[PDB]
Design an enzyme around this catalytic site. Structure first.
Site, PDB file in Angstrom:
ATOM      1  CB  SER A 128       3.823  -1.361   2.389  1.00 33.24           C
ATOM      2  OG  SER A 128       2.681  -1.898   1.744  1.00 33.24           O
ATOM      3  CG  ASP A 172       3.006  -6.840  -1.199  1.00 31.53           C
ATOM      4  OD1 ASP A 172       2.653  -6.596  -0.070  1.00 31.53           O
ATOM      5  OD2 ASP A 172       2.491  -6.291  -2.206  1.00 31.53           O
ATOM      6  CG  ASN A 227       1.334  -3.328  -1.280  1.00 37.80           C
ATOM      7  OD1 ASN A 227       2.082  -3.754  -0.364  1.00 37.80           O
ATOM      8  ND2 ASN A 227       0.863  -4.102  -2.235  1.00 37.80           N
ATOM      9  CD  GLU A 275      -0.057 -13.702  -2.652  1.00 35.75           C
ATOM     10  OE1 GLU A 275       0.264 -12.623  -3.155  1.00 35.75           O
ATOM     11  OE2 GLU A 275      -1.075 -13.871  -1.947  1.00 35.75           O
ATOM     12  CG  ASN A 310       2.485  -5.354   3.023  1.00 30.91           C
ATOM     13  OD1 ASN A 310       2.561  -4.543   3.894  1.00 30.91           O
ATOM     14  ND2 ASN A 310       2.294  -4.918   1.805  1.00 30.91           N
ATOM     15  CG  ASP A 312       0.365   0.736   2.324  1.00 30.10           C
ATOM     16  OD1 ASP A 312       1.250   0.225   1.629  1.00 30.10           O
ATOM     17  OD2 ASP A 312      -0.038   0.050   3.283  1.00 30.10           O
TER      18      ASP A 312
END
Ligand SMILES: CC(=O)N[C@@H]1[C@@H](O)[C@H](O[C@@H]2O[C@H](CO)[C@@H](O[C@@H]3O[C@H](CO)[C@@H](O[C@@H]4O[C@H](CO)[C@@H](O)[C@H](O)[C@H]4NC(C)=O)[C@H](O)[C@H]3NC(C)=O)[C@H](O)[C@H]2NC(C)=O)[C@@H](CO)O[C@H]1O
Length: 129
Positions: free
Chosen positions: A50, A52, A46, A35, A59, A48
């Protein structure tokens, strides 16, 4: 902070993740590795809008507030910046809520594609635990 493999394992164990919701410690170390490469400061955006955050790439669409993800949730009740700390307590506490939300570790895409079904025990080899 960039954790060492065994250093991370120990911090994770200490924080009660070994076997949390039936997920052995090697699962969590493997998730972290893929990750964020064990970097608490990792951030990724991301499509959209958003973002992380941290060692477990939590997220902002659902788990933390970063004041820039319109109409998202804040299920862990924390500012996303808290997830980038050298101290993994917030990250681990939030992870515990995530894993129990119905999909288990499938919540972590790197986990699903690179850890799920592999010999995760290798991730903790040679660690003093
Ligand atoms: C580009 C890219 O893919 N980036 C990755 C990020 O997406 C990824 O973060 C993960 O994002 C997914 C999709 O938003 C998210 O999964 C959603 O999580 C919610 C919350 O648990 C699920 O909703 C629950 O569903 C269960 C079962 O249906 C219900 O019982 C429960 O009531 C629901 N909870 C709520 C609050 O309504 C969604 O089902 C689920 N959506 C999908 C499509 O699976 C993950 O939670 C995100 N993971 C994390 C750790 O934040 C990020 C992290 O690895 O990786 C980016 O690369």
């Amino acid at each position: 902070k960039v954790f060492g493999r065994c250093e991370l394992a120990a911090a994770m164990k200490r924080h009660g993740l070994d076997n949390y919701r039936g997920y052995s410690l090697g699962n969590w170390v493997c998730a972290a590795k893929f990750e964020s490469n064990f970097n608490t400061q990792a951030t990724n955006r991301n499509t959209d809008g958003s973002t992380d955050y941290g060692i477990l790439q939590i997220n902002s669409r659902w788990w933390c507030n970063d004041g820039r993800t319109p109409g998202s949730r804040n299920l862990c009740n924390i500012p996303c910046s808290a997830l980038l700390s050298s101290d993994i307590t917030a990250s681990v506490n939030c992870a515990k809520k995530i894993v129990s939300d119905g999909n288990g570790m499938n919540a972590w895409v790197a986990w699903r594609n690179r850890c799920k079904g592999t010999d995760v025990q290798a991730w903790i080899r040679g660690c003093r635990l």
